[PDB]
Amino acid sequence: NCLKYSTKCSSFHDMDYFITKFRDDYGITPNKQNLTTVIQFYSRKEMTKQAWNTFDTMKFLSTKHFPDICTYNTMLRICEKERNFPKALDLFQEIQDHNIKPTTNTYIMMARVLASSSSNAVVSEGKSDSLRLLGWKYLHELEDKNLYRHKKDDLNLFLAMMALAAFDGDIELSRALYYLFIAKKYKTLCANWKGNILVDQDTIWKSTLMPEMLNYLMLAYARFDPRNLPVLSGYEKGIELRRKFLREFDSSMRLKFKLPFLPISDLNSEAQVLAESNAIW
Amino acid sequence: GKGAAKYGFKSGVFPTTRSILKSPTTKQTDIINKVKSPKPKGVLGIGYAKGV
């Protein structure tokens, strides 16, 4: 708990003090959970080398200290921060090899790692489209089986999808997902608000507008190329997924609160892209 | 022809250039200090021991 709060406030001095205090005065050395919390500390501080060394020690010291799926998800997050997809795939294969059972967070982390890696040709090693397709495949593999879900995972999932939509320049999918998220969030918060809706519009709307979703939508706008064909269109599963999301977006638009999306399924020109970017901004 | 590869691919030899000053000068403080420094004692050194 001490290390948890220290990570949350990102205080190096508190982490060091608590670890030293326990070692010197109580004879307690960090276990698997505390070492995982230290790895998350190093991740928060952008300290990837130290986190990887801690992971190596977690494997080294004993089987009780050996990493489990939570630590592997943390390492997948570190790879996402590095945009290091070969290590992500290697860690997934190691998870399978050591008989550790994946979780929903594992598949979502793999999809996000591949989406982040596919941003540019340099980081993706010229494999950007294949990496995005592989992330979509990981999301499908998640769809197949239940695994262990977490309350936050659902949110994460949608971000991953938008990431795969944002780095693909899929403006139709990005628009649809952004509208779905904003609509559901506002509906849920208004349905469960103690305060009167009219008075507390500012608070509800502030909570509704997640900055990262807007950032992903703007990134999708920025990567616009009329000749681009979505990577998700090739698969039959992918094209069905696109059909489902676009149909729900269209139906929701056709059916209170309003957003400034133009009354068109897709944008086919630069001027409309500029107009929608300004409108949403 | 092969050995010339060591010497910059130059075939033939010049006579060895002579040193104007055959012995070190007294203004070379470092050489004097090395000469005057205590000799390393024992076998990794260069000198007779005290008792021998």
Partner: protein, 53 residues
């Protein structure tokens, strides 16, 4: 002959000074990596790592 001897002595001293500068610069280069390493190890959580083992 006077000119030759004096210039030879000056030349020898100049080489000695050049070697002194070279060695001193290399030692400050070692000081530079001393500065660099402490930045990396300013991040001491004092837990024991495998690379340190």
């Amino acid at each position: 002959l006077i000119e030759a001897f004096r210039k030879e002595e000056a030349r020898l001293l100049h080489k000695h000074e050049y070697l002194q500068k070279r060695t001193k610069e290399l030692e400050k280069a070692k000081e530079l990596e001393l500065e660099k390493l402490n930045k990396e190890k300013s991040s001491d959580l004092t837990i024991m790592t495998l690379d340190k083992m």
